[PDB]
């Protein structure tokens, strides 16, 4: 079922720029002086939605920038917030990424280069019963990639922007 997400400003890395409607995120030039919430990503340029899921099937849609430097998908609640944490499934993050002009599923120890054409808006489908996170290009709902995961805890929508000049935006 459809979920209306808002970004959680307590989690946001201080270099990120969130939109006032808490749907949009970009990377800024300099770090804002933000109160040090324990949930805040102090180093990785990440932000979670406020909503986490422990059961059921849920979907949302993400508008993506055409320029390099984003990743999104889901993170387990216990993802490390403090220090430079590897962006890997073992560290509790399951994401797609645009980097070096190439779409990737962020697998380890090697990322997986995807076949897809240019992406504009992507549906993310989280199933905690089946144990799946799936991505679709919204135009014709074409499957891009599925991670099979045995989720053991609450899972949050995850967004990351690591370059100026691109963005992610919840639809």
Author numbering: 340 to 510
According to the publication:
Human TRIM7 is a 511-amino acid protein that displays the canonical TRIM/RBCC motif followed by a B30.2 C-terminal domain. The TRIM7/GNIP1–glycogenin interaction was shown to be mediated by the B30.2 domain, whereas the CC domain was involved in the protein self-association.
To contribute to the understanding of the mechanism of action of TRIM7, we solved the X-ray crystal structure of its B30.2 domain (TRIM7B30.2) in two crystal forms at resolutions of 1.6 Å and 1.8 Å. Even though the packing of the molecules in the two crystal forms is different, the structure of the four independent molecules is very similar, showing backbone root mean square deviations (RMSD) smaller than 0.5 Å for all pairwise comparisons. During the refinement process, electron density that fitted well to a malonate ion from the crystallization solution was observed in a positively charged cavity found on one side of the pocket, in all four TRIM7B30.2 molecules from both crystal forms. Malonate is in the same position in three of the four molecules (chain A from the 1.6 Å resolution structure and both chains in the 1.8 Å resolution structure) hydrogen-bonded to Thr384, Arg385 and Ser499. The most external carboxylate of malonate also forms a bidentate salt bridge with the guanidinium group of Arg487 from a symmetry-related protein molecule. Furthermore, despite almost certainly being a nonnatural ligand of TRIM7B30.2, malonate binding reveals the existence of a potential binding site for negatively charged regions of such partners. Only Cys455, whose side chain points into the core of the β-sandwich, appears not to be modified according to the electron density maps.
